[PDB]
Amino acid sequence: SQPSTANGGFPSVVVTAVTATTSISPDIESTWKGLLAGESGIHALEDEFVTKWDLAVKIGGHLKDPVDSHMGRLDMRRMSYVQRMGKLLGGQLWESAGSPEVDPDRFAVVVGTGLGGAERIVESYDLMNAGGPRKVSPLAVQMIMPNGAAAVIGLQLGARAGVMTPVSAQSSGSEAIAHAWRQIVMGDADVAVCGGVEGPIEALPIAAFSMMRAMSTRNDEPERASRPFDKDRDGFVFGEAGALMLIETEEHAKARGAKPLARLLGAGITSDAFHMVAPAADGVRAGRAMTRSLELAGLSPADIDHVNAHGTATPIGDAAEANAIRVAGCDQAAVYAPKSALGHSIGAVGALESVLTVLTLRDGVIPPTLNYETPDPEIDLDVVAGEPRYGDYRYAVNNSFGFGGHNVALAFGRY
Amino acid sequence: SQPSTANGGFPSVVVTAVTATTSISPDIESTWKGLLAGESGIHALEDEFVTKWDLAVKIGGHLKDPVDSHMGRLDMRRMSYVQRMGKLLGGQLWESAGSPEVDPDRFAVVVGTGLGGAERIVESYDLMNAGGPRKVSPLAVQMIMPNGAAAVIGLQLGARAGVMTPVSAQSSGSEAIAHAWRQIVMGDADVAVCGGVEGPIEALPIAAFSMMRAMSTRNDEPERASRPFDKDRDGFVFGEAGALMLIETEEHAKARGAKPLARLLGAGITSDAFHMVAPAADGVRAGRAMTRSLELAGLSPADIDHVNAHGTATPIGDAAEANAIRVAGCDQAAVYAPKSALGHSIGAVGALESVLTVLTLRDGVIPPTLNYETPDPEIDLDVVAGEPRYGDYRYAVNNSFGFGGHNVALAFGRY
């Protein structure tokens, strides 16, 4: 018989702490209550690079509390933005967990990102062109390497059982956590800090995503633009985030008297082999990922009460994911799509949405999916909307999919 | 009794085909032959950006046969460099394995890289600065995304059991092979194309790496510059490469009639939590990676006949690595350092060197480490040199270490 969490095959792994910075708040708890009050982080873009380039997208969600307003002249010179965000959340998370003294030989870190420290690439490039090789920072390399944030967090908190950085574009935050759960259940570690980081909204990233027609242009109502599964959706809205969580065996937590917020039960990772940016319309492979997170957890489709959807709010994207949920036998679960209020944080998004899945299992509630005003016939899912819905949610799947056809599903439980 | 490969805990995994392009040959069997004949792939840099930027480093090993000389006008505009390298090697490896017909849903891809399609970032940046947002191509995100090369190979070959990209700098290509094994013995896959690809020697990469002052500046004698474990080493040499290997269950391979070139038995991934770019002096966490690989393969250190050494030819790296080999208790092993001849390929190197470890095992011979002319006392390793060294090699560890504090060790065995 194949091992699973349920049959004692895998060690029990629990979530003991979470941390996030959102367009709604620097505090995950304030964001949670903000989401439950039906609030949106999406505002009008006020950065002068908007009119300057007369961008077709003029809305989005900046962090409520700027990362760099916590960052010294040394950090600003020595780190890239993701590395700085990494330090912040990495710092904030450890205190939240009581600042545990762990055996770092049993302590890993896994944090994904969309690109890494890309501002440092263009800077180093501008400088070399104007003043040559000597103008390049001796720290250019470590600031640019996309494993930069993870390495910073590993060094910062002291992890010596591996610092890993999975990249799969928009599912990097989920895959980050899925690999942290593997390192643990395979005997490589006892505890791990995991999640995803990502950079702030800028001109170049808007242009690149706009030129694919992937982004909403409902500029005149910033808070109505992001409409996952709504019949009138027209693409995603940028919504800056960063998120981390602490996971450890249920016995490691027990020992240090740590109260688990939820359980991480299993992880599924598949691929489409279909298109470089378009999701496979049939949802089969994405649905296989959900199934696979279930098999490792020892749960059946019927067991799943909630589904935190990727829900980017694009026509083919939300439609492909509706099919995915039906292949997985999970179309009778209560569905929520956080991007309705928090936008798309690319590499961070999956990890932020994983913390929301955990807060749903802890608190027994699902926030309303914003802007869900016209059910799309093709979708046909139980989209929680209008009000927060309460129930004894016991099992949930967090979904995330990236460009390259990456499908990451995480099985969660209530502690 | 925890699972090992020897005790039955894990499925048996075999390497059934390999492919590599280097500074010596576009052909892995001809690179091997020249490496044994005592060939260097390093030469004088004749690119005009060399004089233009007056760079302190004017030596490196360009690819014997340029990737773009095999790429049409279509591929040249729809892919970044590393995507185009991966397409070439993916298709080269596939045929070398016989163009197998495998279950797509049990077929995975894990390829590591240093940063991704970075040339496309600076191109899109120049384009926008010069003609605005609509001068960014709709294909830029898929060309830039760090997972791009792996996605391209997964689309190309049809990998629907996961397409992953681990990034850990210089160990990226080793860690990818690590994660494919994991992926198979965890039962998410039965066959996996895996390794690393990397971009070419270019002006801005040289500038950035020599600003850290860790590059050899021995431009008068390109072939004698990369001197790992030599007392008179002065930093690393760029040597271009990309490489892939095909792994599968011994059962999957027997059922299609593939001849295993070696076995993949285990892997260990740890981290130093010491410095952002420098390895830990004591080599402890690094040795621990090696140790972890043996614990999983079911081997004692006394069984390891040969260590394929990261051996970057920097003072502190070689010094730290020798200590890790003693921590691992593998100091009686025959040590080869391939960078002495083929140079450093960053994201691709650990994969290239994993392929070499397989040819050592298969052909029961080790090539000479070039330039090893003065034994450095502190080092104290049995380094192969002068002439290749034949012998009865049954097991071997391949070491890869990366900026950010990463240590990857892979345990291989003769089939």
Ligand code: NA
């Ligand atoms: Na989600």
Ligand code: NA
């Ligand atoms: Na090596």
